[PDB]
Amino acid sequence: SAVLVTGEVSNVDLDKTTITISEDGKTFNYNYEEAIFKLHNNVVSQSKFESLLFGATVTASKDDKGVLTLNIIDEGVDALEHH
């Protein structure tokens, strides 16, 4: 499960299910539609994940089969709180 990046979520687009993750001045973009979602390594639903996603710290990783996992390390807030 190669790690792609660990860092802060920005630019959350819930409609397009896309995020940007930033680490060390670099930006990584993901469509999380088909991702496995975790919260402190606990598997969770998309909805739960999105509820804590804005400004979250997330690790993005991919197994040998190309399946994307997005794990919230440090909790963000929901779309409505973010405003």
Residue numbers in the entry: 766 to 848
Paper text:
The S-layer is built from one or more (glyco)-protein subunits, S-layer proteins (SLPs), that self-assemble into a highly flexible and dynamic lattice through an entropy-driven process, allowing for structural adaptation in response to changing environmental conditions. In this study, we introduce the SymProFold pipeline, which utilizes the high accuracy of AlphaFold-Multimer predictions to derive symmetrical assemblies from protein sequences, specifically focusing on two-dimensional S-layer arrays and spherical viral capsids. The predicted models were validated using available experimental data at the cellular level, and additional crystal structures were obtained to confirm the symmetry and interfaces of several SymProFold assemblies.
High-resolution experimental data confirming the proposed assemblies at the atomic level is very scarce. G Proposed assembly of Viridibacillus arvi (gray) with the 4-fold symmetry axis shown in orange. Aligning the crystal structures with the SymProFold models revealed a great similarity, with RMSD values of 0.65 Å for V. arvi and 1.38 Å for M. voltae, further confirming our predicted assemblies. For the assembly prediction of S-layers from B. brevis and V. arvi (Slp1), an additional region above the core, responsible for the self-assembly, is present. The domains and residues in this layer might be important for interaction with the environment, including the host.
